[PDB]
Amino acid sequence: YLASLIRSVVALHNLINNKIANRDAEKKEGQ
């Protein structure tokens, strides 16, 4: 359970990074 919790937290952090990168890329491309 501890292992799965850590893995899920890491996955969420990766998704947050991906969202930030995608929004930055789209904003830069638009402007």
Binding site: L2, L5, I6, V9, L12, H13, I16, I20
Partner: protein
């Protein structure tokens, strides 16, 4: 200057004698221990309670049938410890992830 030291020596000797006489057992009658050690039931009970509270030996009293259940306490599992501190670390990491996302999106 002498009375205090002699009282401390008395308490230490009583502790050592109690340990020696209680080692060859797993469940004893406070009456039997008192008879072995040549003291009074109330005094031996109070000393045993103080020792147990201060964690001198692994045992729990029972003032009913008049018993001293001695045993060995299994060592605290270090895995649950490390897991708990890791849970705390991940909680503060989740706080950091909030600070990132909820403020940049």
């Amino acid at each position: 200057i002498i009375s205090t030291h002699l009282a401390k020596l008395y308490d230490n000797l009583l502790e050592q004698n109690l340990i020696r006489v209680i080692e060859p057992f797993s469940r004893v009658q406070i009456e039997h221990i008192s008879s072995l050690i040549k003291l009074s039931k109330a005094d031996v009970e109070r000393k045993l309670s103080q020792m147990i509270l201060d964690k001198k030996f692994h045992g729990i009293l029972d003032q009913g049938e008049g018993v001293l259940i001695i045993f060995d306490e299994p060592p605290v599992d270090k895995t649950y410890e490390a897991a708990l501190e890791t849970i705390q670390n991940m909680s503060k990491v989740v706080d950091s992830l909030y600070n990132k996302a909820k403020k940049l999106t």
